[PDB]
Design a binder for this molecule. Structure first.
Ligand code: FE
Ligand code: FE
Ligand code: FE
Ligand code: FE
Ligand code: FE
Ligand code: FE
Ligand code: FE
Ligand code: FE
Ligand code: FE
Ligand code: FE
Ligand code: FE
Ligand code: FE
Lengths: 159, 162, 162, 162, 159, 160, 162, 160, 162, 162, 162, 162
């Protein structure tokens, strides 16, 4: 499949791997956010339940932008169940936790991991000579870092 | 209270039966709507604004299902009974306490009443279908989906303490 | 029930007086909201759809003014009293007839009750202002504007026959 | 015509039965949609604007139910039959009078046709459920809820004369 | 975790399994719909690309309704990457197809499987004495059967 | 001087300005009439007729503004003040002592029918002066005025 | 049927002529609206979704132009004739085939029928202007713009094969 | 008879009807004035002043309707026809031969200031008659009229 | 380029004539849209923001009329000619100055070009109607209404100095 | 600074008095707007998201009441004083702590400051009415309604601990 | 063409360099916008409506980026050059063929030009950053994201044939 | 104050550097937001309405950028400093004059302050990038694009005098 897009061939290759790696952990994190959303229980239920839906919409939008960029560079976006299981960097989410603080701890671990993977991806994409992909990761980084603060702010003090 | 003439051909015996089921449910749904605002105004505690605002969503839903149920009484040739006196004589809910304020207090009182109305509407689906009115049973099924979801949102605030 | 501490500095005797005015008005406004839907569902006659739909706009208005009155009770450190039992013990409205159907019969019944509530709210403006609480008086003035317009809409339907 | 292959695993005998029920209902729902606009344009009398406008809301609902019924035929591998000739050969409604103008005369003509289509769709829910197709029965149940309410809105204009 | 919801205990158990089984295949199908959306190529690209986004929104809405019902009945909704991999009934989606007809064939297989699983779930949920859950599956069935027709209509004739 | 590059001939401009300012005065009076009736009608169809007349008033506001703006595009002065309308309207004074809905409908039907018919003539007179753009403004107004006249007459054309 | 009195002063002979033009065009526009949905449900082939959705846009436009044409008949004192029997007796379109599925086959059948209604409406503009009714000719000119654009959209799918 | 359950005393009703119908006539004239200026103004600030005056006209339409509806709630007849407005307005005839923006702003400032000041007095006279609900209608109108008068005067209060 | 076959029955010589009128107008409308943005970006002076924003509304209008004119060419079986090279060979507008900045200088330059295009479109109405195509004439009349209003808006800024 | 001439006829002594009241209140409202965002960004604890989002609603309300107060100063011929230096010189609020994070600590600090501005505005209503300016007293009454409701929303999070 | 004075402190050498980069890109983006509509009007073939409508989304995007690029020229003290003559002298695109109709023909011509502009804007990001203007580089980066996505949407229609 | 723990792995020295840059910028952006409204209320002259309205659009943008900058401080574990006292101690803007009214005098005062804040944020992009924080540099880049356009809109009102 040819493309007129003239980003260098080795920059395309490099950046497609960065993209598809991040895609898998973003899709996993999208699944995790709904898993916590459905099963959380405790005094702050409705506010955290609803917040997690806004995070899921953001993850859906950044995972679509990342996958569409793979394809613009001539690759294959890899977001099926099997590609995500083989490529995700996140540990399996616990399916036997319910308390809000337990889900906040588990989400903070994973949100922090994805936020920091995307932070790295900005630099790696820019250094590869693709500032257009680096801006896709920068936009994702701004939402991931804000979502990470929102979650951490719930546990940084007890009252 | 005159029976009204209509081309709707649901049998007369099914109409009478389901009108009773509807009006009974209507009274407890109106009382539950009043209860929901009573709690909403008077709740106090650390989760005030989120619980306050959630209760207004519930009240809109109870207004919509109470209206669909009352309209169905009239479609079947009956009289919808939703005045203050009808609600007082027919509601199945215990009087709501007017001297509670803590959020957890209101949540326990709301869960009692939401669970009673949720379960009443779950029975009304089966009773309406068995009386031979699946259109009325579908009205109650839509109400049951929102009452079971609302009962879950209330209970999930107290099922764990952290 | 218990009084709540607040930084709001309206004098305590003014708070006590105006909470009584607001809770009294709240019970009749909630009863009038129930009456509005009772008529909405059961009226029948040549202008059915227009009058049926108009009454839904009136019910939304009553819901918004009832909410603003109740919230004001609580801002002044009181307990808003809007449960079925509080409304039944405090409403000034006569029980609404459940055996009427003609539009003109509902209009008469509604005009009587809308008039009573419009005039109650009119007096509440003045009583609130004399107690030194123009903020509460403005809540009642906003409600009075809507109640007097709604009363006019109802009466204009029966003031002429053609 | 011809049967189209689908992965949809509703049994073939149930598909054939329910396609017949859906296309039969589609023809009377399309005729009723044309009837609704025929009456809407030609209404004359004191109740004109509200009845004229209400009939457009009913037309939009009949368009949406008729589209849902037709799409279900095709989902099951059939051919939806909604052309002028299919509707003429399959409708159960008597020709609408083109020489009536008084609103009461259109209301009675509409009540007869709306009653027939409401009651046809009421039976379609049970026939579809008996065939083992609750998905199609739900399409007819949603239609029934709007037909029964529309029938009540029509009849409520003539059940009382004031 | 108690609930006032009085559906019988054995109906709750039965229906939670039906729900969580369907949840896994619906989430897998949601992933598949975006995998095809990103990678399809051919003359009908934009129309099929855009249609698949509407299907994904529908699957997101029915998977949320199914998962929230599990929890209303006192269960645990199971939608993490690992729960979906262990419970999905769909075969791995091919990651090396691009032609629109290849993706339509693969989506038709999977949409047909999920549509037919949900059709069964209506009956099983109703027979268990839970018409409120059966209506959740009925609403999903109407969208799955329409989406299945939309996909099949593209291949039922060649012009 | 209201010098413009618009090349419609100067005599056509002056002819069409007069047609537009005459219609503007009767449209503004009819807009005042519509609210006068709206506020004071009483009877069984009150809310439906009350709300309908507000839709008619918005339409008259939009056509009156399009007619006035066209006068100014053609180099004229739009004449829509209270005194201009009193000296140019063709409508008879609306009665201020009627309340029954049927009495307002008869009074509105007379005045709506006069304005609808003046606008119908204005299409042809503007086209015949060689200004089909102004004729289109009046055609758009005639479609609304004729529809509004039918909605009013439909209420009185049969007794029930 | 009967003619209704109106203050509208279009001359009586022009009213009679244009009512005939309007009711004639109304019948073919309503039949084209039915055809457009018939094709839409039963289309099969690679450009399914785009053509299916486009035909829904065309049906909304035909609904709005048919309503504008009908409403003009009544403004001029006539009776709008849009029932199933009136459409059957007056339509100029040939019966739409119910056994075609391929999208190119629906496109050819739609192009024949849209071309006929576009050319009928083009002629209606000049016949209405000849009768001295530019207001009615504008209704038809608005319809002609949408019909000629919709005919080009259909024909542009078949004028080239790649 | 316009018998109502509204219990404002009959003498207060008649006093406040007169205040409302007097203000209604000057508000309707000012709404006509606002469009008269809007159509015919010419000069460097054309589009901004042209569009602002449409916002003012919508506000006058809404206050005039609230004032008229209050007359009828109190058992009166709202008087807003062309002839009622000509016999009751307090505004001087607007000039039809002015075009410069500064000339329209001066003419509008005179008339906006008169209506703003009549409405200011109407608040107190309605409250003193024992009708704070009608006083609130005039207070809402005064807030818009005083803001509109400031927007007009701000254009002329400094030269640049 | 080549002629396209269509069912549209406007006579072939009329089609040919009106395609020439439409393509000629299209080139000057596209050049005027470019000129409108050139002025929008570069104007400077005391009424900058109001005039800058107004020109964006004019550009959207020119875009919509340019699109309607071009689409009409193609409906009549022609080829719409809107590329940079077609516009350069067919525009009637003089090159816009790139070294002006004062608002009054841009207004003068725009008034000249808006006047030329408004007057071209005015003549196109008549030429289209004389060729027997009132549908195309109505496209030009809609554009003329917007062009004559936009010309007035521009000229009203310079017709007085205060 | 300088006073500007206006046709507004509120007496000159009333204008001077109310301009002082307005500018005084403007300074404390702008400082409260800054405080509300200071707390919002730095809140930490279990009810983070609900309190964070609620404070944004309060900031929009303070922006709209501060703008209405400032605009009234200028309507009366004065100079609105809302710059950083004017706020610093005129605010009645104590400096907000920048080293607090726990949500209960921000709630106590916000309650002190919202209570002060609510009570200042309550007094401003009566001082404006005493000066003979009911139009200005209405601006402050509208602000008082939102300040008293926002103060209750803050205090209701701390009046009970569960 | 005068240089305009501004407080913006980007160095003069960077301003001059980036103004040239912007104006060059502006000319090819305007030509590409014209090309996009040229194709949109004249395309014919089986995927007509989907491709026709997609091209209008592209044209809106090119209008938005062309505007942001031209505005940045002026912010840096330059003259935006977007007239017909400037575009003709500066565009890098070959003249678009006016005698092609097949969708695949238009797609190949569009992909050539979209690829040239996409690649020009990709270079402009780096050239603007290296000239020391990351704010301008961000304008080009936003444009590059939409041009690369649009180039992909065009190429994905021809990268496979089924 | 104190540092909050976060999983955010931007190096600690980069976090400290960039928190200083963000809080310094926040104080001048808040002061500029207050300046913008100070000028907006007190403008007098022929250009009043369009300048008054434009300044509210700039205020909304400064609110949104200032919120984004403050939130980034907290994301990095810092304390956002936006209270009246922090702004007074940290702003780089000279006090805005309260005794100017002519629009040209406010435009020059605004141009000075907007220029200073545009140029401060331009340097913040490069300082943040030098610290290894492109996420924070993008926040300042988005702010820069709106500050530079707002500065050009202000300066374009005074760069020419006609
Ligand atoms: Fe996408
Ligand atoms: Fe209802
Ligand atoms: Fe509330
Ligand atoms: Fe459909
Ligand atoms: Fe959910
Ligand atoms: Fe206008
Ligand atoms: Fe209609
Ligand atoms: Fe009104
Ligand atoms: Fe187009
Ligand atoms: Fe303001
Ligand atoms: Fe722009
Ligand atoms: Fe924020």
């Amino acid at each position: 499949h040819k493309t007129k897009n003239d980003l260098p061939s080795n920059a395309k290759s490099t950046v497609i791997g960065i993209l598809n790696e991040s895609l898998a952990s973003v899709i996993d994190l999208a699944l995790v956010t709904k898993q916590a959303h459905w099963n959380l229980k405790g005094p702050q239920f409705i506010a955290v339940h609803e917040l997690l839906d806004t995070f899921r919409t953001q993850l859906d939008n950044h995972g679509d932008t990342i996958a569409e960029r793979v394809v613009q560079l001539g690759g294959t976006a890899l977001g099926s169940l099997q590609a995500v299981s083989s490529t995700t960097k996140l540990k399996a989410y616990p399916t036997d936790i319910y308390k809000i603080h337990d889900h906040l701890d588990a989400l903070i671990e994973r949100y922090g991991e994805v936020a920091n993977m995307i932070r790295k991806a900005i630099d790696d994409s820019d250094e590869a000579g693709d500032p257009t992909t680096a801006d896709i990761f920068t936009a994702a980084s701004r939402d991931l870092d804000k979502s990470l603060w929102f979650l951490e702010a719930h546990v940084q003090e007890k009252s």
